[PDB]
Motif scaffolding. Sequence first.
Motif, PDB file in Angstrom:
ATOM      1  N   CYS A   1      -4.760  11.311   1.462  1.00 32.05           N
ATOM      2  CA  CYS A   1      -5.303  12.498   1.630  1.00 32.05           C
ATOM      3  C   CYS A   1      -4.294  13.252   2.767  1.00 32.05           C
ATOM      4  O   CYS A   1      -4.415  12.811   3.960  1.00 32.05           O
ATOM      5  CB  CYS A   1      -6.608  12.617   2.202  1.00 32.05           C
ATOM      6  N   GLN A   2      -3.641  14.277   2.475  1.00 29.84           N
ATOM      7  CA  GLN A   2      -2.765  15.063   3.476  1.00 29.84           C
ATOM      8  C   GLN A   2      -3.525  16.207   3.931  1.00 29.84           C
ATOM      9  O   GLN A   2      -4.208  17.012   3.219  1.00 29.84           O
ATOM     10  CB  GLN A   2      -1.471  15.457   2.768  1.00 29.84           C
ATOM     11  N   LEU A   3      -3.065  16.670   5.326  1.00 29.07           N
ATOM     12  CA  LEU A   3      -3.845  17.770   6.033  1.00 29.07           C
ATOM     13  C   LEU A   3      -3.133  18.918   5.430  1.00 29.07           C
ATOM     14  O   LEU A   3      -2.626  19.244   4.375  1.00 29.07           O
ATOM     15  CB  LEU A   3      -3.655  17.526   7.190  1.00 29.07           C
ATOM     16  N   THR A   4      -2.923  19.891   6.482  1.00 29.94           N
ATOM     17  CA  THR A   4      -2.281  21.246   6.199  1.00 29.94           C
ATOM     18  C   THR A   4      -0.664  21.009   6.139  1.00 29.94           C
ATOM     19  O   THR A   4      -0.236  21.826   7.007  1.00 29.94           O
ATOM     20  CB  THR A   4      -2.689  22.305   7.477  1.00 29.94           C
ATOM     21  N   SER A   5      -0.128  20.059   5.404  1.00 33.66           N
ATOM     22  CA  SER A   5       1.160  19.874   5.503  1.00 33.66           C
ATOM     23  C   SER A   5       1.981  19.456   6.704  1.00 33.66           C
ATOM     24  O   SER A   5       1.787  20.216   7.762  1.00 33.66           O
ATOM     25  CB  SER A   5       1.777  20.979   5.075  1.00 33.66           C
ATOM     26  N   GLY A   6       2.447  18.049   6.691  1.00 31.87           N
ATOM     27  CA  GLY A   6       2.828  17.347   8.051  1.00 31.87           C
ATOM     28  C   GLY A   6       2.425  16.104   8.101  1.00 31.87           C
ATOM     29  O   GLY A   6       3.420  15.175   8.421  1.00 31.87           O
ATOM     30  N   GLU A   7       1.052  15.838   8.393  1.00 36.63           N
ATOM     31  CA  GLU A   7       0.507  14.457   8.617  1.00 36.63           C
ATOM     32  C   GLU A   7      -0.286  13.941   7.425  1.00 36.63           C
ATOM     33  O   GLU A   7      -0.765  14.817   6.688  1.00 36.63           O
ATOM     34  CB  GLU A   7      -0.448  14.681   9.576  1.00 36.63           C
ATOM     35  N   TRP A   8       0.102  12.852   7.085  1.00 35.64           N
ATOM     36  CA  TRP A   8      -0.715  12.027   5.916  1.00 35.64           C
ATOM     37  C   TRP A   8      -1.750  11.130   6.527  1.00 35.64           C
ATOM     38  O   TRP A   8      -1.631  10.171   7.514  1.00 35.64           O
ATOM     39  CB  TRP A   8       0.489  11.266   5.194  1.00 35.64           C
ATOM     40  N   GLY A   9      -2.773  11.202   6.113  1.00 33.13           N
ATOM     41  CA  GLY A   9      -4.017  10.440   6.198  1.00 33.13           C
ATOM     42  C   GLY A   9      -4.529   9.573   5.104  1.00 33.13           C
ATOM     43  O   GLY A   9      -4.094  10.106   3.632  1.00 33.13           O
TER      44      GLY A   9
ATOM     45  N   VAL B   1       0.907  -1.261   0.005  1.00 34.05           N
ATOM     46  CA  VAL B   1      -0.112  -0.137  -0.015  1.00 34.05           C
ATOM     47  C   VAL B   1       0.713   1.153   0.098  1.00 34.05           C
ATOM     48  O   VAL B   1       1.177   1.656   1.003  1.00 34.05           O
ATOM     49  CB  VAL B   1      -1.202   0.025   1.270  1.00 34.05           C
ATOM     50  N   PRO B   2       1.180   1.794  -1.170  1.00 36.65           N
ATOM     51  CA  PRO B   2       1.809   3.186  -1.179  1.00 36.65           C
ATOM     52  C   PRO B   2       1.142   4.291  -0.695  1.00 36.65           C
ATOM     53  O   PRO B   2       0.320   4.909  -1.563  1.00 36.65           O
ATOM     54  CB  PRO B   2       2.007   3.246  -2.885  1.00 36.65           C
ATOM     55  N   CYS B   3       1.481   4.552   0.448  1.00 30.47           N
ATOM     56  CA  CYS B   3       1.022   5.947   1.182  1.00 30.47           C
ATOM     57  C   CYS B   3       1.811   6.412   2.444  1.00 30.47           C
ATOM     58  O   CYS B   3       1.294   6.400   3.558  1.00 30.47           O
ATOM     59  CB  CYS B   3      -0.683   5.429   1.373  1.00 30.47           C
ATOM     60  N   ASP B   4       3.075   6.633   2.067  1.00 30.58           N
ATOM     61  CA  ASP B   4       3.999   7.026   3.107  1.00 30.58           C
ATOM     62  C   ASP B   4       4.228   5.987   4.004  1.00 30.58           C
ATOM     63  O   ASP B   4       3.667   4.727   4.085  1.00 30.58           O
ATOM     64  CB  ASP B   4       3.711   8.406   3.902  1.00 30.58           C
ATOM     65  N   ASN B   5       4.798   6.266   5.331  1.00 31.87           N
ATOM     66  CA  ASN B   5       5.156   5.134   6.200  1.00 31.87           C
ATOM     67  C   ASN B   5       4.374   5.807   7.653  1.00 31.87           C
ATOM     68  O   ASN B   5       4.690   5.084   8.660  1.00 31.87           O
ATOM     69  CB  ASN B   5       6.456   5.082   6.439  1.00 31.87           C
ATOM     70  N   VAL B   6       4.002   6.865   7.615  1.00 37.04           N
ATOM     71  CA  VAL B   6       3.431   7.570   8.794  1.00 37.04           C
ATOM     72  C   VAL B   6       1.872   7.407   9.133  1.00 37.04           C
ATOM     73  O   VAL B   6       1.534   7.553  10.338  1.00 37.04           O
ATOM     74  CB  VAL B   6       3.315   9.168   8.565  1.00 37.04           C
ATOM     75  N   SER B   7       1.213   6.671   7.928  1.00 35.45           N
ATOM     76  CA  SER B   7      -0.017   6.015   8.216  1.00 35.45           C
ATOM     77  C   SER B   7      -0.239   4.702   7.696  1.00 35.45           C
ATOM     78  O   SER B   7       0.705   4.003   7.044  1.00 35.45           O
ATOM     79  CB  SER B   7      -1.086   7.370   7.259  1.00 35.45           C
TER      80      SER B   7
END
Length: 55
Positions: free
Chosen positions: A16-24, A1-7
């Motif tokens: 879907c990323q927020l106001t830059s910083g966290e990825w959801g 699942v290609p979607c960063d490693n933070v989520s």
Amino acid sequence: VPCDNVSSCPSSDTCCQLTSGEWGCCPIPEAVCCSDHQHCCPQGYTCVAEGQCQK
């Protein structure tokens, strides 16, 4: 699942990323493809008259 490693998202999900910083992960609404590249219809169907879906 290609979607960063933070989520973590199950199956095919969109990043879907927020106001830059966290990825959801945003709830995937079954993003299929149709004749035209400006629409989308259920798997096995196509976008006709740019409104409804046909076979």
